[PDB]
Amino acid sequence: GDHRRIRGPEESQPPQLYAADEEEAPGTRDPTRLRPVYARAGLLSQAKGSAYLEAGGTKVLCAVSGPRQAPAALRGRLLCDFRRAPFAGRRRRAPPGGCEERELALALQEALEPAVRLGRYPRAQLEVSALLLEDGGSALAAALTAAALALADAGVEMYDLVVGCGLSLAPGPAPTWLLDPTRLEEERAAAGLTVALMPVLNQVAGLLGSGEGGLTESWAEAVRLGLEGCQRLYPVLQQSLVRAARRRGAAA
Amino acid sequence: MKETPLSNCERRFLLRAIEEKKRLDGRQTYDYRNIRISFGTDYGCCIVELGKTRVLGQVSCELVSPKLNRATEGILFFNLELSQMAAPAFEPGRQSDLLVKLNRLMERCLRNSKCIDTESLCVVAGEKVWQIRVDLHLLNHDGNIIDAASIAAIVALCHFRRPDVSVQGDEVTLYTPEERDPVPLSIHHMPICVSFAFFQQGTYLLVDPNEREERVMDGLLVIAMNKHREICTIQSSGGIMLLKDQVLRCSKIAGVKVAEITELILKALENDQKVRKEGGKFGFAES
């Protein structure tokens, strides 16, 4: 029993597991397709920088609590707190977590440390806080992109932006690499993958993957496909940042 | 915050008065302080104060699914809290060593000695059994806890009464204290610890040390006993080198001490029952 939250029931299982049906399968689509993206920077007020990204059922926030006092030893730091709202996903999980939240946090940190330049932010720790309001597919990639937007918004220095992209594998007899999929295409999947790069200097920053199976060539094709997707996505984020800067110029 | 430091003057004076076999308040070495046992209104509450050290003890019950390894006998849950009113240093989550050692010692003493009947408190063997928890709280800290904590847990667990229950097959019916008379517990023997403090590597030994004597002592010997001369636990702490004859003598002391404390406890319970059988929601005993 937790003594910092309200007294609820010991255990609670959802109703779906008590359902009786073969859930609907997506079917067919253009494998090299991308979902419609709404990215806006400057949403939140009380934060030095914030960003919001929506792609399908995916809905993610990120805020940046700026430098807070706390060479190669007087080098900045950034600690990232990924956190999925308990009302995302078919199932509910207590807020704490402790299994995948921390894994994805490590991922974000490993993908952000390269882009950000911390020599110019010594003796300081940037608190990055991501929040996943709704899970609808590629989540870690949305989180990378949103954190990048929030950083670039707060005005922390960089070398280039971070663009992510998630891929899955069709378990059909002719397995094809499915780009920017949905939670259904992702739970009915064999393998998953996530790339994240910096498109100007064309360098990966952090990737990840897993598989019911695969093979070298397949993984390589997946990688390059995700790279092309990230390239095709970059301009949206560019325009978003320009727009937010124009609104700031307008405010004063 | 922090405890005020100890001056070398007081330290040396204490060591000398020990050398000369002189305590501070005016008692000998083989003597406790006046311990008072006062009761509350609710069956299961006891405030025991030895000198300045006051400790509160509450006993509560619940019904819960037992643990598979022991589906016949029930459960018991100790807990001791060091309230910030006991002393400044007792901030939450800071003096954890003392909490750990005290709680383990008390658990050991009472539980593993089989002081109460974990079997008598069975209701449905496999589904629902009792659960007796005991919360001790430290209010004022002047010296000896373990003795106080133990006397409190014992006075409580001997001054507690369960809501009666009826059963047929699986049909279990609980009832309220106003509909029937709550049933007491089942004790076999009441153990209560006894604390000895060693000074100058083992040369001198005192009983029921105050706070200063605890600050200028190097070692602590706890010994649990009954009125039937049955060692229940003994522990040495403080990183001290004692011997055999020392523990033998300390045990022959704890014998008498526990006998006397036990007589008192019984008298206290007797007086409380007598009072409630005459109108009055209290009970008081004095050393």
Binding site: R5, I6, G8, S12, P15, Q46, P95, E127, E134 | -
Partner: protein, 265 residues
């Protein structure tokens, strides 16, 4: 020199933002924005923002009241709301607000727990209403309560049945049923400066440099669910009846808003 700078506006019967000491800021909602959840509601008062997601699950009741479907609220003030919060467990304000929401849920009686029992003694619903702040510019309790109510109207639940042969229950995620709520508790906040100056919907700074705060929940049928009065320079009933009147007015306003919204869907 903030306090002084602020009294200047106060004595001009205004505020440094453009509010006439007795009116709130732009209040807006959004219902059904989220699919993964049973009920969803976004509320925002200008810069302040809150979002409630209410999930529905099964659970076994107690022995004192088998016919009671639990409603468990929890408030989350993550560090992205404001810098006064740090990554870790919940602080004090989150916990107080959680208990406030729960006290409301229990006293206003907006919902009958009995309306959540399927098979008494065996199953009952549990509504995990998780609220999250996203901009703590001030007056978070009003927003929390209003978002809770909104989502708790949005929520429509499935229907379940019991089979004696299987001795288990089945759900029908196709057909559903809304959730009946009787009372519509709205919360109205107040900040009391030195003696007699009560401002309504106080933002952040106005609460930082204030002598006391007050919150009042006012059900529709001229009743009160909670008068949260944590400390303060003091008040007499004369400085309280006015707050109650203003609370009734705010009740009317926000109920009209919520009706318009649930009808624009």
């Amino acid at each position: 020199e903030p306090l002084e700078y602020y009294r200047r506006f106060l004595k001009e019967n205004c505020r440094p933002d453009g509010r006439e000491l007795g009116e709130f800021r732009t209040t807006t909602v959004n219902i059904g924005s989220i699919s993964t959840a049973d009920g969803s509601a976004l509320v925002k008062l200008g810069n302040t923002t809150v979002i409630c997601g209410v999930k529905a699950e099964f659970a076994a009741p107690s022995t004192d009241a088998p016919d009671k479907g639990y409603v468990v609220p929890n408030v989350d003030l993550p560090p992205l709301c404001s810098s006064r919060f740090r990554s870790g467990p919940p602080g004090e304000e989150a916990q107080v607000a959680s208990q406030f929401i729960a006290d409301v849920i229990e006293n206003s009686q907006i919902i009958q727990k009995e309306d959540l029992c399927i098979s008494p003694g065996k199953l009952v619903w549990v509504l995990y209403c998780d609220l999250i702040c996203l901009d703590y510019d001030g007056n978070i309790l009003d927003a929390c309560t209003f978002a809770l109510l909104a989502a708790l109207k949005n929520v429509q639940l499935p229907e379940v049945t019991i089979n004696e042969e299987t001795a288990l229950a089945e759900v029908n995620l196709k057909k559903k049923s809304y959730l009946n709520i009787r009372t519509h508790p709205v919360a109205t906040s107040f900040a009391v400066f030195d003696d007699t100056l009560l401002i309504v919907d106080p933002t952040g700074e106005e609460e930082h440099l204030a002598t006391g705060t007050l919150t009042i929940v006012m059900d529709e049928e001229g009743k009160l669910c909670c008068l949260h009065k944590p400390g303060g320079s003091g008040l007499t009933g004369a400085k309280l009846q006015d707050c109650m009147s203003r609370a009734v007015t705010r009740h009317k306003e926000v109920k009209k808003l919520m009706d318009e919204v649930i009808k624009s869907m």
